[PDB]
Amino acid sequence: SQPSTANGGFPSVVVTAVTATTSISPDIESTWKGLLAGESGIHALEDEFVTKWDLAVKIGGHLKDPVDSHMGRLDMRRMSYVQRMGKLLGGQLWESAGSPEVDPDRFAVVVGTGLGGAERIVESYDLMNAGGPRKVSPLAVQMIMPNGAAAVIGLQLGARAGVMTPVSACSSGSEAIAHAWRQIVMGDADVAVCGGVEGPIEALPIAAFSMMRAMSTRNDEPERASRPFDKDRDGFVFGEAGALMLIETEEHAKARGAKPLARLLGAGITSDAFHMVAPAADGVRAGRAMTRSLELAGLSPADIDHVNAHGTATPIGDAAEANAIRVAGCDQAAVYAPKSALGHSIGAVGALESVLTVLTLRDGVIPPTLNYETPDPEIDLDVVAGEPRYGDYRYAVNNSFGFGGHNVALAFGRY
Amino acid sequence: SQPSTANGGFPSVVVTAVTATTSISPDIESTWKGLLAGESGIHALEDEFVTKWDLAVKIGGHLKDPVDSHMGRLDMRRMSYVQRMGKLLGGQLWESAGSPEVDPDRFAVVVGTGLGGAERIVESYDLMNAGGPRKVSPLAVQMIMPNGAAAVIGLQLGARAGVMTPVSACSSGSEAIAHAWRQIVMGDADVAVCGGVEGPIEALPIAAFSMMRAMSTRNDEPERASRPFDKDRDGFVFGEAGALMLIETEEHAKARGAKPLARLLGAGITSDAFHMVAPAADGVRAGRAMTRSLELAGLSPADIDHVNAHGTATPIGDAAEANAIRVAGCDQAAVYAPKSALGHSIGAVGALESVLTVLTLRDGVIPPTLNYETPDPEIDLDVVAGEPRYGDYRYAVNNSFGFGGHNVALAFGRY
Numbered sequence: 001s002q003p004s005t006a007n008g009g010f011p012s013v014v015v016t017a018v019t020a021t022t023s024i025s026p027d028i029e030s031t032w033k034g035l036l037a038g039e040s041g042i043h044a045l046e047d048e049f050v051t052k053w054d055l056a057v058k059i060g061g062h063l064k065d066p067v068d069s070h071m072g073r074l075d076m077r078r079m080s081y082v083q084r085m086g087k088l089l090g091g092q093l094w095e096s097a098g099s100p101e102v103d104p105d106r107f108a109v110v111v112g113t114g115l116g117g118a119e120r121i122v123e124s125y126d127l128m129n130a131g132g133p134r135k136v137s138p139l140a141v142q143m144i145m146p147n148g149a150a151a152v153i154g155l156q157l158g159a160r161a162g163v164m165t166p167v168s169a170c171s172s173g174s175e176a177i178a179h180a181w182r183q184i185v186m187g188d189a190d191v192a193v194c195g196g197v198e199g200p201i202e203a204l205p206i207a208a209f210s211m212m213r214a215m216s217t218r219n220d221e222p223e224r225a226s227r228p229f230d231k232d233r234d235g236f237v238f239g240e241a242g243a244l245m246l247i248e249t250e251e252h253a254k255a256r257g258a259k260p261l262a263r264l265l266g267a268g269i270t271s272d273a274f275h276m277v278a279p280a281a282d283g284v285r286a287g288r289a290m291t292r293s294l295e296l297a298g299l300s301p302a303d304i305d306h307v308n309a310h311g312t313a314t315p316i317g318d319a320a321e322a323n324a325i326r327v328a329g330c331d332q333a334a335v336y337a338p339k340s341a342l343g344h345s346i347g348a349v350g351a352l353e354s355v356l357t358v359l360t361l362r363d364g365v366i367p368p369t370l371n372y373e374t375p376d377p378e379i380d381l382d383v384v385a386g387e388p389r390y391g392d393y394r395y396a397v398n399n400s401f402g403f404g405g406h407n408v409a410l411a412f413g414r415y
Numbered sequence: 416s417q418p419s420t421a422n423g424g425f426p427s428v429v430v431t432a433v434t435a436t437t438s439i440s441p442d443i444e445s446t447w448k449g450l451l452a453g454e455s456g457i458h459a460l461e462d463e464f465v466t467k468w469d470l471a472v473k474i475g476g477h478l479k480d481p482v483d484s485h486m487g488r489l490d491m492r493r494m495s496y497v498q499r500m501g502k503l504l505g506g507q508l509w510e511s512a513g514s515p516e517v518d519p520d521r522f523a524v525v526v527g528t529g530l531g532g533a534e535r536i537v538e539s540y541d542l543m544n545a546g547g548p549r550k551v552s553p554l555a556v557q558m559i560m561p562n563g564a565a566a567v568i569g570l571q572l573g574a575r576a577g578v579m580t581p582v583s584a585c586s587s588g589s590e591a592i593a594h595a596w597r598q599i600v601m602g603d604a605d606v607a608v609c610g611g612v613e614g615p616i617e618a619l620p621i622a623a624f625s626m627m628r629a630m631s632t633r634n635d636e637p638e639r640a641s642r643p644f645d646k647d648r649d650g651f652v653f654g655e656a657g658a659l660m661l662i663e664t665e666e667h668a669k670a671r672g673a674k675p676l677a678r679l680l681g682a683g684i685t686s687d688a689f690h691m692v693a694p695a696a697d698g699v700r701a702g703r704a705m706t707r708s709l710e711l712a713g714l715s716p717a718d719i720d721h722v723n724a725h726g727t728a729t730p731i732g733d734a735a736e737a738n739a740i741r742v743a744g745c746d747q748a749a750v751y752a753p754k755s756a757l758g759h760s761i762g763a764v765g766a767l768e769s770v771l772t773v774l775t776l777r778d779g780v781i782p783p784t785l786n787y788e789t790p791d792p793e794i795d796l797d798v799v800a801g802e803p804r805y806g807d808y809r810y811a812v813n814n815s816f817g818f819g820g821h822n823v824a825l826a827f828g829r830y
C-alpha cells in the first residue's frame with residue numbers, strides 16, 4: 001500500500017500554536033469569539049483614495065489593530081509592510097508556543113504572500129531618478145525580494161532547514177502549510193512555522209478586481225455585503241489578515257510538553273488549467289485536491305464532518321466550489337464560509353482559514369456563515385447559519401483556491 | 416532504512432528534454448558548444464540607461480535572441496515579460512520532447528522567478544492616475560500576479576496536477592526543479608515541466624547590487640570580468656537567461672519512447688538563518704543542502720565526480736561555497752562555474768545550470784571556467800580551466816544559493 005498518516009507511512013504532525021491579525025481583532029481567540037457572536041469585520045472604507053477615485057466599492061475590513069502601530073522607526077524604514085507583519089506575527093507565535101529552544105537544523109519556515117503588498121520597488125526608482133544610482137539603498141535588495149517576509153521570519157526565529165515562499169494568489173497561505181507538512185513528512189524538518197501574509201487594502205487592487213465584476217458593491221450595508229453561497233451574492237469583499245501556525249511531529253511536541261490543538265493529516269495541490277482568472281465550472285480538479293488530501297491522510301469522504309469553504313461570494317466561484325465538494329463526495333459535510341465575516345485577504349486567507357479549521361475541531365463548533373438567508377438550488381450544501389452549530393467534528397477539509405486555477409485542500413483532524 | 420532513489424524507496428526520475436535562452440544563443444545545444452569553445456556572453460552594455468546614470472557597471476550579457484522578437488502585438492499587450500519568456504520556452508520544450516500527449520491529471524508545472532521582471536504594476540497605476548479606476552484593464556490581475564509565468568505555462572501545456580512558483584531569489588530556478596522532483600516522488604505527478612525565468616538587465620537592479628559592492632566593474636575587458644574562484648575576482652556580472660526541463664518517471668519515459676538525457680536523483684533545501692543578503696562564511700548549511708541531496712539520492716560524497724558551482728565571483732560568496740563543498744565532503748570533485756561565461760540570471764540561473772549539469776553528464780565533458788588564472792589559497796578546489804575537461808562523470812551536484820540564505824542542491828546522475 002501507499003503511505004498515509006492513518007497507516008503510519010507518514011509521521012504524525014500536529015498544530016501546537018496559532019496567531020492571526022484580522023479585521024475583528026489582533027488576538028486570534030478574540031476573533032474566534034467574535035465570529036461565534038456573529039460579528040463582521042467589514043465596514044465603510046474611510047480612506048481618501050475611495051473618494052478621490054469615486055470607487056464603485058466603498059467597503060472592506062482593515063485590520064482592527066494596524067501592524068505599524070507596533071513598529072518603530074528602524075523597522076518602518078528598513079522593512080517592507082509584509083516583512084513587518086511577518087516579524088510581528090512570528091514573534092507572537094513563538095511566544096504563544098512557550099518560546100521553545102528547537103534544533104535550528106530541523107526547523108523550517110514556509111510563508112506565502114499574495115497580490116503584492118508591493119510598495120518598495122517604486123520608492124527605489126524615485127530615489128534614483130532624483131539622486132542617481134548611489135541614492136538607492138544598500139538595503140533595497142532585502143526589502144524588494146519577494147522571499148523577504150519568509151526570510152525575515154527565518155532569520156528572526158533561526159530556521160535552518162529551509163525558508164520557502166510559495167506564490168499561488170489566493171491559495172498561497174494554504175499552499176505554505178501544505179509544503180511545510182511535506183517538508184516534515186519527507187524528513188527534512190521536525191518543526192515548521194507556516195502560513196501567509198498580505199498587504200493592506202489599496203486602490204489599485206480594488207479597481208482591478210472591480211473591473212472584473214468580482215466584488216460586492218452593497219455599500220449601504222457593509223456587514224451584509226459578503227454573502228457566500230447565498231442566492232443574492234454579488235462578489236467578494238476585501239478584509240485584511242495575516243496568519244501563522246506552528247506545526248511539528250507529535251513526538252517533538254510530546255518531548256517539549258506542547259499540547260496539540262489539532263492534527264494536520266494531509267494536503268492536496270492540483271490545478272485547473274482552464275482560465276487565467278476564472279475557476280472551472282465543473283469543480284473537478286478542485287474536488288481532486290480535496291480527494292488527494294484524503295488519500296494522504298488515509299480518510300474517506302464519509303469521515304469528513306466539516307468543510308471550511310474557500311467561499312468568496314462570487315457568483316461563479318461559489319458555484320464551482322459546490323461542484324468540487326460534490327466531486328470529492330463531501331457534500332454531506334457542514335460548511336462554513338468565513339469570508340462572510342472576515343472578507344478576502346488573498347495571500348493570507350488560506351492560512352487564516354486553516355487556523356479557523358483548527359479552532360473548529362478543538363472547540364466542536366462552527367460559527368454562522370453571515371448573510372446566508374436564501375439557499376441557491378445550484379449550490380445545495382449544508383451551510384451553517386443563524387447561530388453557531390455545535391457538533392462532533394472529527395475531521396475537516398479547508399479549501400483555498402487561487403486565480404490561475406490553483407487548488408489547495410488541507411485535511412485536519414481533532415486531537 | 417529511509418527511502419532513497421538508489422534503494423528504490425523513490426521512483427526513478429529522468430530528464431527527457433531541455434530548453435534555454437542565454438546570452439550566447441537561443442539554442443541550448445549551441446550555448447553548450449559555445450561554452451566548450453570558451454565563448455563568453457558578456458559584452459559592453461549599449462543601453463542608454465547606462466550613460467544616463469553613468470552607472471559604475473557597464474557590462475553584462477543580454478539574450479542573444481530577444482524574447483520579444485518572437486512576440487506579436489497581443490502577447491506584448493496582454494502578458495508580462497516573464498509570461499512571454501515562459502510561453503516561448505514552454506512551447507520550445509514541448510516540441511523538443513516530441514509534443515507528447517500526457518495525462519493532464521498527472522502533469523505538474525513548477526517555475527521559479529527571481530528579482531522582479533516587475534514592469535506591469537506601474538503601468539496599472541498610470542492608467543488609473545489619468546483615466547480613473549475604469550481605465551485599469553480587466554486583464555491587469557493576470558499580468559501582475561507573481562504566479563503568472565507558471566500559470567501561463569500550465570494553461571498552455573494543460574498541467575492539472577499542480578502549478579507552483581517558489582521564490583528564493585537566486586535559487587528559485589533550482590528550487591523549482593527540487594519541488595517538481597518531490598511532486599513526482601510523492602506520487603502527485605508522473606511528469607513535470609520545471610525551471611526558471613527572469614526579466615532582462617535593467618538599471619535599478621544594477622544600482623542596487625552595485626551599491627552592495629557585489630558587482631564587477633572591469634568594464635575595459637567585459638569578457639574577462641566574471642572570475643569565479645579566481646584570486647582577482649571583484650563581483651558578479653549579470654547575464655540574461657531562462658531555462659526549463661522536462662522530468663518524468665523512468666517508466667513514463669519508457670512507455671512513450673523518450674530517451675533520457677540524465678537522472679534527477681535527489682534534492683536538498685536548507686537555509687542559513689545568518690544574514691539577509693550575505694552567505695554564512697562557514698558554508699555549513701549550504702554544505703548540508705548538498706549532503707541532503709546525497710541522502711535522498713542514496714549516494715556518498717565519494718560518488719560525486721562533478722560540482723556545478725553557484726560560483727558568482729563575489730569575494731565572500733565563492734569563499735563560503737568552497738567551505739560548503741568541503742563540509743559536504745565533495746572537495747575532490749571537478750568544479751565548473753558557468754557564471755564565468757554566462758553571468759548571473761538570478762531567478763533563472765539555477766535552472767540553466769541544472770540543464771548544463773545534465774549536458775555535462777550526457778557528454779562526459781566540463782567546459783573551462785573562464786578567467787580562472789590564479790588559484791586562491793582559501794578556495795583550494797579543483798576548478799576546470801584552460802580547455803574542456805573530458806571525464807568519466809557518473810554523478811554531479813548543482814549548487815544554487817540565493818540572497819536570504821536559501822540553499823538548494825540537486826543531485827543528477829548519468830543515464
Ligand SMILES: C=C/C(C)=C\[C@@]1(C)SC(=O)C(C)=C1O
Pocket residue numbers: 170214236272275276277278279280312314316317401402403404405406
Ligand atoms: C481557481 C479559482 C479562481 C480562478 C478564482 C477564484 C474562485 S479564487 C478567488 O479567491 C476568487 C475571488 C475567485 O473568483
Ligand SMILES: C=C/C(C)=C\[C@@]1(C)SC(=O)C(C)=C1O
Pocket residue numbers: 585629651687690691692693694695727729731732816817818819820821
Ligand atoms: C546565501 C547566499 C547569499 C546570501 C548570497 C549569495 C552568495 S547568492 C548570490 O547569487 C550572490 C550574488 C551572493 O552574494
Ligand code: NA
Pocket residue numbers: 308309310311353398399400
Ligand atoms: Na477555507
Ligand code: NA
Pocket residue numbers: 723724725726768813814815
Ligand atoms: Na551551479
